[PDB]
Design a protein around this ligand. Structure first.
Ligand SMILES: Nc1ncnc2c1ncn2[C@@H]1O[C@H](COP(=O)(O)OP(=O)(O)O)[C@@H](O)[C@H]1O
Ligand SMILES: Nc1ncnc2c1ncn2[C@@H]1O[C@H](COP(=O)(O)OP(=O)(O)O)[C@@H](O)[C@H]1O
Ligand SMILES: Nc1ncnc2c1ncn2[C@@H]1O[C@H](COP(=O)(O)OP(=O)(O)O)[C@@H](O)[C@H]1O
Ligand SMILES: Nc1ncnc2c1ncn2[C@@H]1O[C@H](COP(=O)(O)OP(=O)(O)O)[C@@H](O)[C@H]1O
Ligand SMILES: Nc1ncnc2c1ncn2[C@@H]1O[C@H](COP(=O)(O)OP(=O)(O)O)[C@@H](O)[C@H]1O
Ligand SMILES: Nc1ncnc2c1ncn2[C@@H]1O[C@H](COP(=O)(O)OP(=O)(O)O)[C@@H](O)[C@H]1O
Lengths: 151, 151, 151, 151, 151, 151
């Protein structure tokens, strides 16, 4: 098995374009366990604290704005190397550099409207999870298919 | 347009059988607007109240127990006639009576494992939404395709 | 076999909501032949003759305006009962009476934004076919699968 | 649970048009258990003995021919009311009368090239199963999801 | 944003093997705009100017014959890097070097039956675009999702 | 064309997680020809011989046991470079190293539960086909789209 968690957020462009279910499907079909799921308009404070290590950049202002401009689906997924694998499923930050088959590769175009975020490290993951979710919103259960997903 | 809402819950079998994404995708692609989304283990109290109109039924205690046995995905969806046509999308209560193309017709077999719940009326819907969600959890936004979904 | 034809048009909500590829796909996988396919910004004059049998109706005016308000995907499909069965595939004129499985029942909500036009009759189809398409534009070929599609 | 079995055969037109996996997917996603699966060119004798209760009809000659003209996928599926439900999933014999959402409804056109067969009764089922399969080709195992499919 | 254009053609194997709806779908869901769309039985003269840079090559003769041997779906797609990224989406010229996820990598096998043409450059695209399409036939409109597709 | 064949088996996790249809569908849609298909519980003897080149590996006994723990779908697929490009479709041995768009990249997580086997060479392929199938079980037919898949 493995209880490694990651934080995946669907951005407002992802919501606005009706990509929520498709994105969730990709994680389910892969065998990752859904741990947390909420739908929220994320506050400026939250998005600032979240994207904080990128305050120095000339897209940060417009970033926080856009991320506050609509609703986001906040998710926590569990499984073996979710963080790393999840990021591969996502694709490269820039959808022009994301390979076909990937989420960004398949469904979006420009880096500022790249539909989705996912943690870049297990460090980022736990910070992002504590920041977007309350402990009691992370649900624990066992997949019926656990023994067929994991040795 | 219409601001009518319905309550849709994905039952623990739905979550266990990896249908969250699929189900959300059908509501999205139909043009309906996601208003609330949460992942939780429902308390028996909650469930008993949820299903209070059925307290006098042979299946009630089983229903409550089964509904408490795993996590559910609680959702709120908005649109013209969402309640009535949301139920059409779900199929009949019994998956044997649900037609191919409906969520239950396509994805499940037995009545006690019918994967999804939908409000049966506007009155029920609002009772159910108030019971499962706080109004601040319900997100207001306008679909970018609104004018293309509604005259 | 049968080389009967029908006019199917994907209205501008269809195009705007990105249902072009999906709608074609459903006719293809049914095993109908793509006879002609044009992406046209239609005209009011063009629309009126098409909708002449509805000039008597209140909505007519705005329909023409809506039908005129953005690009359409204009198409001809060849096959046995492509007229009649294609209308079963469209679902009812009102998306709220359209069954899940049908194109409207899956992808839209309101009678006035019902994403797709089909031909009510072969009578209407021939009338319709010639108005949007000249014989030059219509294509003729044999489906490599024809023998497996019809005895 | 329930161990009711049915016999589903994909006809050569269904194989030739690449519909095998899609058909199997429909049964899997529904929750039915795959019991038997073989791929075969079916003998005239077998097809005659199989379609025997229809020897009196003016399509029987051309039927047996066509059914022998290519390979068939022979399947056995298990579950609650599989025979009856399987036939609903299939659709009406004539694809012009099969509803969208159904296998025939979605993927074929003419009754002589209607892609698929499935037993019309539990009587037919067991006869067809003994006739197409050897006992040792019917595999017994338990779905990991059995308790989520069945009460 | 970006209103750059590219020529994408679905070769006659693509059309014969029923991949029209699926290919469009993949460009749509990527969030590119359908500029123009014609189903043409192409000409040898037409094909030669297109394939002029390959007149020096052995296969050229038969390519033109194959390209000429059945209907094509001729299309223009508008978007940011629709030329370049569209070629990543096509996969390599040889389907055997095309990655799974790409259109060729998923749907075809042999270099000489590679189902789809895309533009090697914007240089080539403009050259290509004008040859198959006149300005009348090209459509102009704004995607209701444009704001969510590009910052 | 090409009459090269490969052996593909769906491992018991593949069958348990409802991926039979999905997997077959990818081989079909790619243009490859299904030659043999059988559903069976593999004997340890069979499996030990199947995997004889790996008898000296730390994982061998586990592999055999796991492979014996449920039914597998044994298949034979034909086409130009099926062996090599069949493996490209599967992903890397380790699903963590398999790219999105591949069967393992999309559908599984751990190396010991990597859902599918494909022959690693022509020599292996023929050894494997001879081991799992009798030549009379392998069905010869011509795809109706052959001329459209192969020059
Ligand atoms: N040059 C840019 N212009 C606009 N937005 C950007 C740019 N670079 C990054 N972003 C946005 O900021 C977010 C965070 O950036 P980064 O951490 O580099 O990528 P990722 O989100 O893939 O970890 C990205 O999701 C992206 O949408
Ligand atoms: N006969 C039954 N046996 C077991 N469970 C049942 C039975 N009837 C209904 N249920 C469960 O109770 C839920 C609520 O029942 P009801 O309100 O009658 O149907 P609906 O869900 O269509 O509103 C159903 O979705 C189903 O899961
Ligand atoms: N009550 C209505 N209100 C608004 N628009 C309507 C109404 N009825 C029909 N329409 C529009 O007019 C078009 C043609 O109407 P009609 O010919 O009766 O239906 P159909 O398109 O099913 O043949 C429909 O596709 C629809 O967009
Ligand atoms: N009028 C007809 N013309 C050609 N083929 C037919 C006709 N009627 C039935 N068939 C074929 O014979 C098979 C058996 O017929 P029947 O038992 O009536 O339908 P089903 O297969 O739905 O049980 C059908 O699958 C169908 O393909
Ligand atoms: N070696 C080859 N043998 C046969 N046909 C080829 C070969 N190389 C290319 N072609 C055909 O010629 C077309 C154009 O070739 P080229 O312009 O090099 O590739 P692309 O279409 O990727 O730009 C291809 O789409 C393909 O159908
Ligand atoms: N390190 C491992 N731990 C557990 N199982 C393994 C390991 N490596 C390989 N296997 C299993 O053995 C099978 C055969 O191994 P190998 O031939 O090396 O890979 P491939 O399947 O790519 O040919 C794999 O498909 C996998 O299921």
């Amino acid at each position: 098995a493995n209880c490694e968690r990651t934080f995946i957020a669907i951005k407002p462009d992802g919501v606005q374009r009706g990509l929520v279910g498709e994105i969730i499907k990709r994680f389910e079909q892969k065998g990752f366990r859904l741990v947390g799921l909420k739908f929220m308009q994320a506050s400026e404070d939250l998005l600032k604290e979240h994207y904080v290590d990128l305050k120095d950049r000339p897209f940060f202002a417009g970033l926080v704005k856009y991320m506050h401009s609509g609703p986001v689906v906040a998710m926590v997924w569990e499984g073996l190397n979710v963080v790393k694998t999840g990021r591969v499923m996502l694709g490269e930050t820039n959808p022009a550099d994301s390979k076909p088959g990937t989420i960004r590769g398949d469904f979006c175009i420009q880096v500022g409207r790249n539909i989705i975020h996912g943690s870049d490290s297990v460090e980022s993951a736990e910070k992002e999870i504590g920041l977007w979710f309350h402990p009691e919103e992370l649900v624990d259960y066992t997949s019926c298919a656990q023994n067929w997903i994991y040795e």
